[PDB]
């Protein structure tokens, strides 16, 4: 029904008024002296419910309705498609002051610039003429449904054909909760907070909420038969009446779901925790509140009167865990996250690269809020001016596309770009400036206490000897990095594994003639691990980074 | 007579499908529960999913799964190959598909299966012709509209889901996307048991070792291995028996007994179809062919064989293993020969790539090729990848003032992100060999990319003696000759000299 | 022949492939030789046209699919296998790829005997020296 | 001629070659002349257009295949032999690579005598000195 749709109260009211007033009391329109339009378009991302709302309007309205669809108009017999559309319009007029709905107009709108066939051009012209031929007293409105607004014949945008359009965008989080509730009345609800589920759900739109609900219901059903051991013989009524989808089902469904827009750009589920990132406590806190304020308190930003910063650059020497911070943020952000690697976007075909940048940023804007992590931004941000002829200006085109798409982030949709480079000396001076990419976080070499924190964070899962003292290690290792400590720990683990395998083969020979002789790592393992331990830090690189930081 | 018997064994039941227990069970629920216990879906209130997308590398049994489900379910089944729908006549392909869907709905509740959707869902935005775009629009309309679906489910099969229109990958049209990837060792064990229970094998059959030693075979690959082994056994026995075109006695038909020699020979002459494009014939180098480097040989052998043979211990401590290693020293010391030896004895897969081989005159194909190679390496893991002369492909980014078009810098950035990025980093080991370690970028030599910097110094007198024994291990020699003099006289020479 | 199937009509090439395979199966237990596959397998990734990928999908369906093959064996010939779709290089579609490389001196001697059996040679000629001195001849 | 067979339309250049060869073998024992093959022989590895590979494969099939030729001979013409696919420069397709370089001074005299037999010049002028002065002038 009309109330069945939801989440777009303003647009539903607009369309309802638009469809009812010229259909309930068209006489008042004549009295006022306005000719109501005949064509009305709605355009939006896939799954927004445009077809749903059109079907509900067809249902809630008592007036007669007719459905047309793009791909079912053309036919093998010559000239019979145009006659089909013509007779459709004649019946639409002859029967009653009805309402006609054309689905997926984009199939019948090739922009007439790439359109080459003669039958398609003829059908487009016939429909244009018929639309223009709809007099004021036609008293029948046509409703067009386009998925993408750019691939539209501009002739159809002229007054008298399609003047009123509605960009039905992704609903608000509160609207998303309302839609979830719409889905949540029919099913059997457990005793327990959809408001939290919507406040945590960020990118999902319309059908995605339905997908989440269905997935949770399926999980609930899945637990029930396996425990009940229900077979093909029959169903047990005691199971049927004892059915309620709980909070854990929704947790599972959210953990197994992703927005349909991001279905292509899904990412491998690598798990990191805030205690895994040893050290960098102030960095971790500042990043977390900077990400938490625009996504939880938009009113607070308005009260402050200054919109938040958008870009940020993590820089430092490698093995300082910058990618680890990226992983941790991707794991605990309560928002969408798209990881992007530099050379991936480039394409040999002329223009395609910038097209890829445009579409990726289109998804980034669609699944707002989002966090686009550009790893190794240098590959893109190569400084230029003396390159002359080499790549073919295509790199310059890519840099220009990125620059124009980085300053064009309005207050709405709040998309944060995370940069990560090892050598900031090669970045273009344009991009580093405020207004397009402002924030610059520096990851220095870990402090000795931070070094101890990192060491303890890396051996969280490793069983360890009771009498193990790490303060000595810290006092010895002064200029090392997290990767170096990881290497030391892996060397110790490999030594322990070698000893365990030696003992196991000795025990197997004994059998031929506790299970783990070393259930944890030993001090001798650390002694041998530090015998082959070295630092990858280049003192000259350290000096260069220090000089650059001073220049900052 | 035989027709009835043939039909019974012809159908491949769900037991035939193996190694994909979780995904097979999930799809079996999705297909059966609304056709076995629909009442629960009326009682709970919600409708079941009515769309599924199978995706994964080829030969993964997805078509086998389609045949198995078709044989198991008694409901109506409609089969549509992807390109089959189109026709020369204008506006008939969509008419044909509409007629198919109408027939499917008219007869009974049914399962439609559309194979190779990648040819049929070109995303409707990058194509220039309109016939494809209108076919996509017609499919989208049938999946979404007045009476979008009426107690009929649609199964699709694809190899490149990322080249599909996003609207087709949406809930309501295709609700669940199943990812049927490479089977695990246990999965390969069940697949072997499935493929080895039909024919007659000798008592020496032991499938566990075969499943352990196979590293990247998926489905049809394993089947191929089995077939090859059997054929080799037939060649072992079709030689001793004469041509005898008229008829063959039972005694040769009986007591066939595909021996373990057949299985091992067929595994040595086979490789996964994924690496079929990149692999080349490899020369043979024994461990005794490599003189000296005893500690280095043992270190590399244990560092490669431990994750592949002892993964339980790694999970006991819950720590990841070391992956990379870089040998450096004067040329001809035996580094490339050592790499060849590692290729010859180690069980893990070997990917030999030359240094400047992968560079391209076009724009971006260097990094695209790097990504393709690394995807292949991580797909058929465990793998060993040898990067010969890293100083050819790896340099300090931006060092060369003269513009190269940024290719080298972008390549090095691709390498950096692949060795340290949003990677899974399961079972890929990078081996480097360069005799000028000053030209490599300082980031590559970092731990987590290349943690082991191994110097290969010059051999000593005892190592020169060991090398002499290794290279004089075949040619006949003088009984009265003692090489101790040769060692005492060679001081600065190398193995090649 | 390889490019023999491609046509201006949309989809007719795949229709021709269907007709070929159905006739091959309808007639007898046959052997089907498809020549020069390097033009009908551009990896589906470097190419940009639509008809060729559609043909590749049709071929992949023909080689493997519902009742893919019964008393039909497919042999193919090509000069470059690396420019071929991996989906065609799997068991069930193309089980085994045989290589035909450079013959040795003995191989050259049999080829010479084959090629020198019908003309009137002199009595002072020998094929051993010819097979030895010939090095890179492909037969 | 070379570029006149190429057709941007899918699967039509191959049809043109098919009709050309069918007519060539239909009529009588025939001599064929394919001008400027370098426009139809990009070696199948450098260029990215699939149409060139397809036409090369079709030409190879026509020049080599099951019951390829009957009483006909094919001749080619090119300015850039080094930029040709090696599969086209094989025995059984194009075995004799004949070269045509600049003629000698005697060649210049012969060409002049060919040119100056239908016109009418003066007695005083001789062609031997004229041929000697024309050093590199060809054809």
């Amino acid at each position: 029904g009309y109330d069945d749709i939801g989440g777009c109260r303003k647009q539903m009211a607009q369309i309802r008024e638009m469809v009812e007033l010229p259909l309930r009391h068209p006489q008042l329109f004549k009295a006022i002296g306005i000719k109501p339009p005949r064509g009305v378009l709605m355009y939006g991302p896939p799954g927004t419910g445009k077809t749903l709302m059109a079907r509900a309007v067809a249902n809630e309205t008592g007036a007669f309705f007719f459905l047309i669809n793009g791909p079912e108009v053309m036919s093998k017999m010559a000239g019979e498609s145009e006659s089909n559309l013509r007779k459709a319009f004649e019946e639409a007029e002859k029967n009653a002051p009805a309402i006609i709905f054309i689905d997926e107009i984009d199939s019948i709108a090739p922009k007439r610039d790439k359109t080459n066939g003669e039958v398609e051009r003829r059908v487009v012209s016939q429909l244009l003429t018929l639309m223009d031929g709809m007099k004021a007293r036609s008293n029948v409105v046509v409703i067009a449904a386009t998925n993408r607004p750019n691939s539209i014949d501009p002739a159809l945008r002229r007054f008298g054909r399609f003047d009123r359009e509605v960009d039905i965008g992704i609903p608000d989080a509160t609207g998303r909760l309302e839609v979830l509730r719409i889905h949540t009345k029919n099913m059997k609800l457990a005793d327990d907070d959809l408001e939290a589920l919507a406040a945590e759900t960020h990118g999902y739109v319309g059908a995605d909420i339905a997908s989440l609900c269905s997935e949770a219901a399926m999980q609930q059903i899945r637990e029930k038969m396996d425990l009940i051991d229900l077979d093909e013989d029959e169903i047990d009524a005691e199971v049927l009446d004892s059915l309620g989808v709980t909070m854990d089902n929704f947790r599972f469904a959210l953990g197994n779901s992703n927005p349909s827009a991001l279905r292509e750009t899904v990412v491998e589920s690598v798990n990191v925790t805030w205690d895994d990132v040893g050290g960098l406590d102030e960095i971790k806190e500042e990043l977390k509140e900077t990400v938490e304020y625009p996504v939880l308190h938009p009113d607070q930003y308005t009260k402050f009167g200054l919109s938040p910063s958008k870009g940020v650059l993590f820089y430092g020497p490698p093995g300082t865990g910058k990618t680890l911070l990226a992983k941790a943020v991707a794991t605990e952000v309560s928002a969408n996250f798209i990881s992007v690697k530099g050379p991936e976007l480039l394409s040999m075909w002329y223009g395609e690269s910038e097209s890829n940048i445009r579409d990726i940023f289109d998804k980034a804007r669609a699944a707002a809020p989002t966090v686009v992590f550009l790893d190794e931004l240098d590959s893109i941000a190569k400084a230029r001016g003396g390159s002359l002829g080499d790549a073919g200006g295509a790199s310059d085109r890519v840099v220009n596309q990125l620059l124009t798409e980085m300053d064009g982030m309005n207050a709405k949709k709040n998309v944060f770009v995370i940069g990560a480079t090892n050598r900031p000396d090669q970045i273009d001076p344009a991009i580093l400036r405020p207004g397009r990419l402002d924030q610059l976080i520096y990851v220095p070499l870990p402090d000795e206490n931070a070094r101890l924190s990192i060491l303890n964070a890396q051996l969280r899962k490793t069983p360890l000897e009771p009498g193990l003292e790490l303060t000595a290690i810290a006092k010895a290792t002064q200029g090392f990095s997290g990767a170096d400590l990881l290497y030391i720990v892996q060397r110790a683990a490999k030594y322990a594994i070698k000893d365990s395998i030696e003992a196991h083969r000795q025990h197997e020979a004994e059998k031929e003639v506790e299970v783990d002789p070393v259930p944890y790592i030993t001090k001798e393992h650390f002694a041998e691990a530090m015998k082959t331990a070295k630092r990858s830090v280049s003192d000259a690189e350290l000096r260069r980074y220090e000089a650059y930081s001073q220049q900052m | 007579n035989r027709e009835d018997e043939e039909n019974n064994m012809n159908e491949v039941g769900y037991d035939d499908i193996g190694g994909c227990r979780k995904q097979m069970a999930q799809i079996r629920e999705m297909v059966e529960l609304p056709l076995r216990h629909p009442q629960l879906f009326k009682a709970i209130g919600i409708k079941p999913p009515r769309g599924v997308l199978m995706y994964g590398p080829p030969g993964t049994g997805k078509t086998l799964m389609a045949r198995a489900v078709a044989n198991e379910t008694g409901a109506f089944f409609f089969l549509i190959n992807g390109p089959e729908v189109m026709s020369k006549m204008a506006g008939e392909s969509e008419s044909n598909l509409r007629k198919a869907f109408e027939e499917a709905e008219k007869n009974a509740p049914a399962i439609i299966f559309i194979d190779e959707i990648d040819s049929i869902a070109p995303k409707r935005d990058k194509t220039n012709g309109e016939v494809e775009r209108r076919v996509v629009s017609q499919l989208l309309t049938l999946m979404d509209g007045m009476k979008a679906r009426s107690n009929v489910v649609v199964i699709a099969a694809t190899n490149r889901p990322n080249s599909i229109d996003p609207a087709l990958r949406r809930f309501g049209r295709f609700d669940r996307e199943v990812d049927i990837g490479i089977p695990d060792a246990t999965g390969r064990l069940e697949v072997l048991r499935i493929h080895t229970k039909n024919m007659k094998l000798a008592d020496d059959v032991d499938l566990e070792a075969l499943a352990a030693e196979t590293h990247g075979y998926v489905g049809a690959d394993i089947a191929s291995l089995c077939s090859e082994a059997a054929m080799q056994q037939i060649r072992e026995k079709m030689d001793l028996i004469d041509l005898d075109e008229d008829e063959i006695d039972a005694e040769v038909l009986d007591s066939l007994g595909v021996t373990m020699d057949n299985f091992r020979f067929a595994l040595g002459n086979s490789n996964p179809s994924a690496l079929r494009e990149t692999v080349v014939e490899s020369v043979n180098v024994t461990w005794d062919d490599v003189g000296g480097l005893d500690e280095i040989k043992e270190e590399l052998k244990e560092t490669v064989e431990y994750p592949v043979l002892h993964p339980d211990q790694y999970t006991k401590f819950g720590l990841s293993p070391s992956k990379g290693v870089l040998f450096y020293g004067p040329p001809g010391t035996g580094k490339t020969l050592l790499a060849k030896a590692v290729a010859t004895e180690v069980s893990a897969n070997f990917i030999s790539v030359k240094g400047p081989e992968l560079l391209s005159m076009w724009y971006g194909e260097s990094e695209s090729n790097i990504r393709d190679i690394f995807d292949k390496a991580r797909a058929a893991a465990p793998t060993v990848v040898f990067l010969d002369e890293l100083d050819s492909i790896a340099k300090a980014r931006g060092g060369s003032l003269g513009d190269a078009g940024g290719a080298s810098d972008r390549v090095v950035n691709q390498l950096l992100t692949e060795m340290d990025g949003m990677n899974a980093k399961k079972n890929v080991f990078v081996i480097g060999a360069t005799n000028r370690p000053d030209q490599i970028d300082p980031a590559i030599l970092r731990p987590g990319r290349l943690d082991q910097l191994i110097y290969v110094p010059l051999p000593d007198e005892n190592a020169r003696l060991s090398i002499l024994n290794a290279q004089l291990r075949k040619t006949p020699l003088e009984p009265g000759l003692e090489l101790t003099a040769i060692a005492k006289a060679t001081q600065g020479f190398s193995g090649a000299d | 022949n390889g490019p023999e199937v491609m046509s201006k009509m949309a989809g007719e090439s795949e229709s021709n492939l269907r007709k070929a395979f159905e006739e091959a199966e309808k007639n007898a237990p046959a052997i089907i030789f498809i020549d020069e596959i390097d033009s009908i397998a551009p990896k589906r990734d470097k190419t940009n046209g639509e008809v060729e990928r559609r043909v590749v999908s049709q071929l992949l369906t023909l080689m493997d699919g519902m009742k893919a093959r019964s008393n039909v064996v497919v042999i193919a010939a090509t000069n470059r296998p690396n420019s071929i779709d991996p989906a065609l290089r799997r068991f069930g579609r193309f089980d085994r790829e045989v290589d035909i490389g450079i013959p040795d001196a003995t191989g050259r001697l049999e080829v010479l005997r084959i090629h020198t059996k019908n003309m009137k040679l002199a009595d002072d000629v020998d094929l051993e020296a010819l097979a030895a001195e010939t090095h890179g001849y492909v037969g | 001629n070379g570029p006149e067979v190429m057709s941007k339309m899918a699967g039509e250049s191959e049809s043109n070659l098919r009709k050309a060869f069918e007519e060539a073998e239909k009529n009588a024992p025939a001599i064929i002349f394919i001008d400027e093959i370098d426009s139809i022989a990009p070696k199948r590895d450098k260029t990215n257009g699939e149409v060139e590979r397809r036409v090369v494969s079709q030409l190879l099939t026509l020049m080599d295949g099951m019951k390829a030729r009957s009483n006909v001979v094919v001749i080619a013409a090119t300015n850039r032999p080094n930029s040709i696919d090696p599969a086209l420069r094989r025995f059984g397709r194009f075995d004799r690579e004949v070269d045509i370089g600049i003629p000698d001074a005697t060649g210049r005299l012969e060409v002049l005598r060919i040119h100056t037999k239908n016109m009418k010049l003066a007695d005083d002028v001789d062609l031997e000195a004229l041929a000697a002065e024309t050093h590199g002038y060809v054809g």
């Binding site: 093998k76 | 003032l401 | 989809g11 008809v51 | 941007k8």
Partner: peptide, 22 residues
Amino acid sequence: AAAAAAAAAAAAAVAVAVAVAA
């Protein structure tokens, strides 16, 4: 009666060059 047809004409590529300075 009418009929449809497929068509694939060409595309546009970009090359990469190397320079030498002094």
